[PDB]
Amino acid sequence: HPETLVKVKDAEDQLGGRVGYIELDLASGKILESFRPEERFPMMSTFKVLLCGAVLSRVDAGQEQLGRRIHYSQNDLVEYSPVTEKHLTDGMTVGELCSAAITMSDNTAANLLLTTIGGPKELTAFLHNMGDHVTRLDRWEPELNEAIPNDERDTTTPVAMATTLRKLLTGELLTAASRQQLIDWMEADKVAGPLLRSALPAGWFIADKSGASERGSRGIIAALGPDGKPSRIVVIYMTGSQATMDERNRQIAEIGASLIKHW
Ligand SMILES: *[B]([O])([O])[C]([C]C1=[C]C(C([O])=O)=[C][C]=[C]1)[N]C(=O)[C]([N])C1=[C][C]=[C][C]=[C]1
Ligand SMILES: [Ca+2]
């Protein structure tokens, strides 16, 4: 419950590796505070929000339909696919795949969606085309979690991710309906309980997306605020440590407690 930047630096002291952090005012885009804002970190599963941003952009362009049903085989399944592995017969709609990728971190869902847009290179092009010249996706799930330092593959920076997330959620890039659908999926996140959500007071809004590598790395991106409306964006990444998952979770939770206390 220290001052937030103090807590972030403390988390890095305890974990080893690097911790990156930024808080943006949602309305203005103003940077409120940051630590290692321009350094690269692996996105891990946080990329799944950007992926669904690209899918929605295609919907807005009349090139995709959220209701379109996709079928796949057992051979398409990769690890960490809790939703898709249950629909080998009936398949899933594009919208259902985005819900699964975002709310359950479903990897096969993400890969199927990557296929719809033309792969990691096209996600990167989508990002470049909306003004993010930093964030890059190079690999599919699960290889994108490899997190080699000093590998620039599959990385973002706290400020690039925060800025891009803000544009996807509030900008004129997506239609109002699509911006709302994206934040709705994030609001319905099911797997980030131990992170920022654990520090969230009653009545607050949060829409988020977490990510993990087996070893060394963790992250979360979020739009949150009091009184049922988001008012800030928070991005936290960690990488390059030997910290346990429990330790990584705890530090993010404590960073969350600090940023709430000192809101
Ligand atoms: B993702 O981080 O690219 C993916 C799926 C995953 C997400 C989350 C989360 O908090 O959203 C937690 C765990 C896994 N990561 C992986 O596929 C990675 N190989 C992995 C798998 C299991 C546990 C840790 C990392
Ligand atoms: Ca340090």
PDB file of N, CA, C and O and ligand atoms in Angstrom, residues 44-48 79-80 105 107 141-142 144-145 191 209-214 218 245, ligand 1:
ATOM      1  N   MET A  44       2.622 -11.640 -24.105  1.00  0.00           N
ATOM      2  CA  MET A  44       1.951 -12.858 -23.690  1.00  0.00           C
ATOM      3  C   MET A  44       0.489 -12.760 -24.131  1.00  0.00           C
ATOM      4  O   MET A  44       0.197 -12.198 -25.184  1.00  0.00           O
ATOM      5  N   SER A  45      -0.432 -13.288 -23.334  1.00  0.00           N
ATOM      6  CA  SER A  45      -1.824 -13.385 -23.770  1.00  0.00           C
ATOM      7  C   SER A  45      -2.540 -12.035 -23.839  1.00  0.00           C
ATOM      8  O   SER A  45      -3.678 -11.964 -24.313  1.00  0.00           O
ATOM      9  N   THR A  46      -1.894 -10.959 -23.389  1.00  0.00           N
ATOM     10  CA  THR A  46      -2.531  -9.646 -23.498  1.00  0.00           C
ATOM     11  C   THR A  46      -2.754  -9.254 -24.964  1.00  0.00           C
ATOM     12  O   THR A  46      -3.600  -8.411 -25.256  1.00  0.00           O
ATOM     13  N   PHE A  47      -2.031  -9.883 -25.889  1.00  0.00           N
ATOM     14  CA  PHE A  47      -2.184  -9.551 -27.306  1.00  0.00           C
ATOM     15  C   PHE A  47      -3.591  -9.881 -27.792  1.00  0.00           C
ATOM     16  O   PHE A  47      -4.049  -9.327 -28.786  1.00  0.00           O
ATOM     17  N   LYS A  48      -4.285 -10.760 -27.075  1.00  0.00           N
ATOM     18  CA  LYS A  48      -5.582 -11.241 -27.538  1.00  0.00           C
ATOM     19  C   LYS A  48      -6.617 -10.118 -27.662  1.00  0.00           C
ATOM     20  O   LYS A  48      -7.523 -10.187 -28.493  1.00  0.00           O
ATOM     21  N   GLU A  79      -2.091 -26.112 -26.452  1.00  0.00           N
ATOM     22  CA  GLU A  79      -2.280 -26.057 -25.013  1.00  0.00           C
ATOM     23  C   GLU A  79      -3.105 -24.842 -24.589  1.00  0.00           C
ATOM     24  O   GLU A  79      -3.139 -23.820 -25.275  1.00  0.00           O
ATOM     25  N   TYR A  80      -3.760 -24.973 -23.441  1.00  0.00           N
ATOM     26  CA  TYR A  80      -4.505 -23.887 -22.814  1.00  0.00           C
ATOM     27  C   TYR A  80      -5.660 -23.408 -23.691  1.00  0.00           C
ATOM     28  O   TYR A  80      -5.757 -22.228 -24.062  1.00  0.00           O
ATOM     29  N   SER A 105      -8.560 -16.689 -21.996  1.00  0.00           N
ATOM     30  CA  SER A 105      -7.198 -16.787 -22.520  1.00  0.00           C
ATOM     31  C   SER A 105      -6.996 -17.981 -23.449  1.00  0.00           C
ATOM     32  O   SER A 105      -5.880 -18.470 -23.614  1.00  0.00           O
ATOM     33  N   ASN A 107      -6.077 -20.316 -26.166  1.00  0.00           N
ATOM     34  CA  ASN A 107      -5.026 -20.205 -27.181  1.00  0.00           C
ATOM     35  C   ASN A 107      -5.472 -20.607 -28.585  1.00  0.00           C
ATOM     36  O   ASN A 107      -5.128 -19.944 -29.567  1.00  0.00           O
ATOM     37  N   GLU A 141       0.216 -18.817 -30.794  1.00  0.00           N
ATOM     38  CA  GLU A 141       0.203 -19.489 -29.496  1.00  0.00           C
ATOM     39  C   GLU A 141       0.572 -20.954 -29.701  1.00  0.00           C
ATOM     40  O   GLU A 141       0.089 -21.580 -30.638  1.00  0.00           O
ATOM     41  N   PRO A 142       1.403 -21.517 -28.808  1.00  0.00           N
ATOM     42  CA  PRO A 142       1.947 -20.901 -27.600  1.00  0.00           C
ATOM     43  C   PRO A 142       3.377 -20.372 -27.728  1.00  0.00           C
ATOM     44  O   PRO A 142       3.930 -19.869 -26.749  1.00  0.00           O
ATOM     45  N   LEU A 144       4.684 -17.792 -28.851  1.00  0.00           N
ATOM     46  CA  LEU A 144       4.890 -16.360 -28.604  1.00  0.00           C
ATOM     47  C   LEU A 144       5.215 -16.035 -27.143  1.00  0.00           C
ATOM     48  O   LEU A 144       5.595 -14.905 -26.822  1.00  0.00           O
ATOM     49  N   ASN A 145       5.073 -17.022 -26.264  1.00  0.00           N
ATOM     50  CA  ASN A 145       5.366 -16.838 -24.844  1.00  0.00           C
ATOM     51  C   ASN A 145       6.821 -17.128 -24.467  1.00  0.00           C
ATOM     52  O   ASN A 145       7.175 -17.069 -23.290  1.00  0.00           O
ATOM     53  N   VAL A 191     -10.404 -14.902 -15.797  1.00  0.00           N
ATOM     54  CA  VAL A 191      -9.178 -15.530 -15.305  1.00  0.00           C
ATOM     55  C   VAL A 191      -8.166 -14.582 -14.646  1.00  0.00           C
ATOM     56  O   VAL A 191      -7.039 -14.985 -14.355  1.00  0.00           O
ATOM     57  N   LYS A 209      -7.410  -7.693 -19.284  1.00  0.00           N
ATOM     58  CA  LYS A 209      -6.874  -8.864 -19.950  1.00  0.00           C
ATOM     59  C   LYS A 209      -5.500  -9.163 -19.385  1.00  0.00           C
ATOM     60  O   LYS A 209      -4.605  -8.307 -19.428  1.00  0.00           O
ATOM     61  N   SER A 210      -5.337 -10.381 -18.870  1.00  0.00           N
ATOM     62  CA  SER A 210      -4.078 -10.820 -18.277  1.00  0.00           C
ATOM     63  C   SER A 210      -3.229 -11.616 -19.262  1.00  0.00           C
ATOM     64  O   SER A 210      -3.646 -11.910 -20.390  1.00  0.00           O
ATOM     65  N   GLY A 211      -2.024 -11.955 -18.826  1.00  0.00           N
ATOM     66  CA  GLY A 211      -1.150 -12.817 -19.605  1.00  0.00           C
ATOM     67  C   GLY A 211      -0.078 -13.433 -18.731  1.00  0.00           C
ATOM     68  O   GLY A 211       0.282 -12.878 -17.685  1.00  0.00           O
ATOM     69  N   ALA A 212       0.410 -14.596 -19.148  1.00  0.00           N
ATOM     70  CA  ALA A 212       1.437 -15.300 -18.406  1.00  0.00           C
ATOM     71  C   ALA A 212       2.349 -16.095 -19.322  1.00  0.00           C
ATOM     72  O   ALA A 212       1.930 -16.601 -20.367  1.00  0.00           O
ATOM     73  N   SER A 213       3.607 -16.188 -18.916  1.00  0.00           N
ATOM     74  CA  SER A 213       4.501 -17.193 -19.443  1.00  0.00           C
ATOM     75  C   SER A 213       4.756 -18.152 -18.287  1.00  0.00           C
ATOM     76  O   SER A 213       4.580 -17.787 -17.121  1.00  0.00           O
ATOM     77  N   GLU A 214       5.138 -19.382 -18.601  1.00  0.00           N
ATOM     78  CA  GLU A 214       5.353 -20.377 -17.563  1.00  0.00           C
ATOM     79  C   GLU A 214       6.327 -19.822 -16.540  1.00  0.00           C
ATOM     80  O   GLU A 214       6.087 -19.874 -15.334  1.00  0.00           O
ATOM     81  N   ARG A 218       4.638 -12.009 -16.569  1.00  0.00           N
ATOM     82  CA  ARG A 218       3.234 -11.828 -16.226  1.00  0.00           C
ATOM     83  C   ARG A 218       2.826 -10.441 -16.702  1.00  0.00           C
ATOM     84  O   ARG A 218       3.673  -9.567 -16.871  1.00  0.00           O
ATOM     85  N   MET A 245       4.666 -18.118  -9.919  1.00  0.00           N
ATOM     86  CA  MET A 245       3.426 -17.515 -10.385  1.00  0.00           C
ATOM     87  C   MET A 245       2.733 -16.814  -9.223  1.00  0.00           C
ATOM     88  O   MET A 245       2.205 -15.714  -9.376  1.00  0.00           O
TER      89      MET A 245
HETATM   90  B1  LIG B   1      -0.885 -16.241 -22.994  1.00  0.00           B
HETATM   91  O1  LIG B   1      -0.339 -15.633 -21.771  1.00  0.00           O
HETATM   92  O2  LIG B   1      -0.167 -16.040 -24.253  1.00  0.00           O
HETATM   93  C1  LIG B   1      -1.104 -18.040 -22.793  1.00  0.00           C
HETATM   94  C2  LIG B   1      -2.376 -18.438 -22.011  1.00  0.00           C
HETATM   95  C3  LIG B   1      -2.382 -18.110 -20.506  1.00  0.00           C
HETATM   96  C4  LIG B   1      -2.939 -16.915 -20.058  1.00  0.00           C
HETATM   97  C5  LIG B   1      -2.965 -16.605 -18.709  1.00  0.00           C
HETATM   98  C6  LIG B   1      -3.592 -15.290 -18.266  1.00  0.00           C
HETATM   99  O3  LIG B   1      -3.394 -14.892 -17.102  1.00  0.00           O
HETATM  100  O4  LIG B   1      -4.315 -14.707 -19.099  1.00  0.00           O
HETATM  101  C7  LIG B   1      -2.451 -17.499 -17.784  1.00  0.00           C
HETATM  102  C8  LIG B   1      -1.901 -18.700 -18.216  1.00  0.00           C
HETATM  103  C9  LIG B   1      -1.868 -19.009 -19.570  1.00  0.00           C
HETATM  104  N1  LIG B   1       0.102 -18.589 -22.158  1.00  0.00           N
HETATM  105  C10 LIG B   1       0.587 -19.773 -22.514  1.00  0.00           C
HETATM  106  O5  LIG B   1       0.104 -20.473 -23.402  1.00  0.00           O
HETATM  107  C11 LIG B   1       1.826 -20.222 -21.739  1.00  0.00           C
HETATM  108  N2  LIG B   1       2.400 -21.394 -22.412  1.00  0.00           N
HETATM  109  C12 LIG B   1       1.389 -20.595 -20.314  1.00  0.00           C
HETATM  110  C13 LIG B   1       0.495 -21.637 -20.116  1.00  0.00           C
HETATM  111  C14 LIG B   1       0.098 -21.976 -18.828  1.00  0.00           C
HETATM  112  C15 LIG B   1       0.584 -21.265 -17.739  1.00  0.00           C
HETATM  113  C16 LIG B   1       1.472 -20.216 -17.937  1.00  0.00           C
HETATM  114  C17 LIG B   1       1.869 -19.880 -19.225  1.00  0.00           C
END
